Ligand binder design. Structure first.
Ligand SMILES: CCOCCOC(=O)N[C@@H](Cc1ccccc1)[C@@H](O)C[C@]1(Cc2ccccc2)NC=C([C@H]2c3ccccc3[C@H]3NC(=O)O[C@H]32)C1=O
Lengths: 99, 99
């Protein structure tokens, strides 16, 4: 699909059997989701944003569907303003910018 | 052009008579650049994201060239970690997400 940018590029994702709204964010290297429960062990990660560097929990090899496309990769969990789908998963679904 | 997301989507922009490197960010409503001088009047604004909020100066009707594509729009100037081209200008150059 082709997504224009006149509005926020919000899509529905599926993770842990539940649906959530997320933002396709090309300016984000990683994917960060609002507080939720994920399986397995996690490692610490510091991510930098417009307002500063914060701490999140890093989970690897997590199943996540983005707009119907299945992906398996790293998902960070922390106090993010919105669910963000970053380049690590955008590349898995074959996303590119065009103009 | 078709820009890959294997790396950060960085491009050259021309604004105020000078060349700079900026990040194409679909997850940002606005465009914000590191401290620089711009012509015309401005109003204060607070923008927030990962890490919190930062105070910026809002300049309207500013001419900019992104990857050789001319456009006009609002440009915020402040202590952003990186130059960011947001949706307000990405739409003007016909930028879309595809997958
Ligand atoms: C994020 C996980 O991987 C690592 C984190 O990557 C980042 O934090 N990347 C930065 C970009 C970046 C910052 C520092 C260093 C490199 C890149 C942004 O792309 C992330 C984000 C997420 C977001 C989206 C909607 C609302 C809140 C937060 N998307 C947009 C905003 C803000 C933003 C940015 C510019 C202008 C106005 C605004 C605001 N108004 C608005 O619409 O969005 C807000 C972000 O922080």
């Amino acid at each position: 699909p082709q997504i224009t940018l006149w509005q926020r590029p919000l899509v529905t994702i599926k993770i842990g059997g539940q649906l959530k709204e997320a933002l396709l964010d090309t300016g984000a290297d990683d994917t960060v989701l609002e507080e939720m429960s994920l399986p397995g062990r996690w490692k610490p990660k510091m991510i930098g944003g417009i307002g500063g560097f914060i701490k999140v929990r890093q989970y690897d090899q997590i199943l996540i569907e983005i707009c119907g496309h299945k992906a398996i990769g790293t998902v960070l969990v922390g106090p993010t303003p919105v669910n963000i789908i970053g380049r690590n998963l955008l590349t898995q679904i074959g996303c590119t910018l065009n103009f």
